[PDB]
Amino acid sequence: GRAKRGLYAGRHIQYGNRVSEDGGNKSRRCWKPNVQEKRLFSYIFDSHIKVKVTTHALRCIDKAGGIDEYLLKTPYQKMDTEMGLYWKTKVEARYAELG
Amino acid sequence: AAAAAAAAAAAAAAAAAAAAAAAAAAAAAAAAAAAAAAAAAAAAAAAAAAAAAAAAAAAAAAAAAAAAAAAAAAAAAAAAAAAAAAAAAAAAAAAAAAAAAAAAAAAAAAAAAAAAAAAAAAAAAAAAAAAAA
């Protein structure tokens, strides 16, 4: 629901039971994903950029090698966050500039 | 020449356009800075090859497609994608003698553009580029 503005890596809250240990009671609850607003560093702008990422997404940006070289990935898989689509197209056009 | 090739195929006659574009290849128009951009649009890159594969070698020989290492990656991609490994290694040695992308660096450069896998089966012409070519 906040992913509409966050870079939540498709990670999505899940609503389900919680089961007691012995009596077996079922009482509803949710599971909210890890969320740590961070200041990543984008080698295009070379200027810190503050967004609300998960840690799944954090580690993914890491492996791909930073926010920049992570942005240059599948738009029809980032297609969850249209503002993410915008991030991608902007950074890709600025690399175009640097080409 | 434009009028003649127009007679060949603006009327869209196929082998006529073929022989006429071979005649323009033989006409060997300039390829200095923008006339080469005209010549590729006269020999394209890759695709059907055949009659074009001649002006491919030819426009490589005009001076070279060394206008850029990047456009040279485009030209090597064309040569590979025309599945013409022979003309491919030919033009390869051609630029090599003709001030290529500095093989003492162009080696690893082709290595990287090969890890990009954009031009794949030209790994054979790359084995040539690493053994003889």
Partner: protein, 51 residues
């Protein structure tokens, strides 16, 4: 994780070496301090050209 150093630094290898390091110790620090870079080839390829 690992990165490549744009300059030598204490307790770490020489300038032009590739070095394995800790994730936070790279992202929060040494990435913006601009002392090392990720080893995606786009940067690996710029290192040996800065040298």
């Amino acid at each position: 994780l690992e990165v490549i150093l744009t300059t030598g630094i204490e307790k770490l290898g020489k300038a032009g070496e590739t070095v394995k390091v800790a994730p936070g110790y790279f992202r929060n620090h040494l990435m913006p301090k601009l002392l090392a870079v990720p080893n995606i080839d786009k940067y690996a390829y710029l290192i040996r050209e800065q040298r």
